[PDB]
Structures are given as structure tokens and as C-alpha cells.
Ligand binder design. Sequence first.
Ligand SMILES: O=c1cc(N2CCOCC2)oc2c(-c3ccccc3)cccc12
Length: 127
Amino acid sequence: SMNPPPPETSNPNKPKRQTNQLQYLLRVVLKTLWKHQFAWPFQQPVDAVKLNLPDYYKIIKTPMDMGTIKKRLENNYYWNAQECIQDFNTMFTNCYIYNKPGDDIVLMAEALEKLFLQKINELPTEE
Ligand SMILES: O=c1cc(N2CCOCC2)oc2c(-c3ccccc3)cccc12
């Protein structure tokens, strides 16, 4: 069994921009989610080999996790906040697609998403 390569986190051809919104996404949003008691499964890509989930990457074709998001924020991969917000949403929706309502991992994702949306409500206006 094999895992796919992780999502891209470095590309010198992709234009980059540091914005106050992206800085908030790293300093407030990512940091707040990372320390939550339910963050740990989401801090790195799903290792479907070690978890014995051989169909995972047959169902989830846009993998995303907060370890990748952290790297993208810390390595200035993004042009805008919407790209980063989309990554968080991809992570949550993957979990809801692959698993059943009320499953433990779904409850964990939902707790993180509730917190994420609360933080997004305070996203600062662009400079
Ligand atoms: O969608 C997912 C399904 C699961 N699975 C299926 C249910 O049993 C446990 C493994 O695991 C996930 C994990 C994870 C769970 C436990 C340990 C490490 C990572 C992290 C992110 C998403 C998923």
C-alpha cells in the first residue's frame, strides 16, 4: 500500500503575497486550531497505509491537512486568504465525505470547523 505525495507547499513560479489577512490566518486561526484537543489527527496528512484505509485515496482525491496549511502559511505559498480558507474547507469536507455522520473523527472535525468559522468572522479587512 502507498500514500500519494503530499499537496504542493513550494513552487517558485507561483506569485506570493504577504497580506494582513494571511498573517491573521497564521497567527490567530491556525494557531488557535492547532492547540485544540481534537487537532492532532489533522496536524499531518492522513497516513492511509498506517491506518489501514486502503480505499482512502480512492475516495478522497483532494487531500488536505493543517500540517500542509501550516507549511503553506509559514512558507508564503498563498496569494490570498481565500486560497487558505479553501484548504481548511477541503480538510473538513474530506472528513465528512469519507466517514459517517456522528463518527468520532467527524465530531472532531466539526468542533474544529465551528472554531474556524468563529475566527473567520473576525478576519481583518485588507490593509
Ligand atoms: O477521514 C478520516 C478517517 C479516519 N479513519 C477512519 C475511522 O477510523 C480511524 C481512521 O482517520 C482520519 C484521521 C486520523 C485518525 C486517526 C489517526 C490519525 C489520523 C485524520 C483525518 C481524517 C481522517
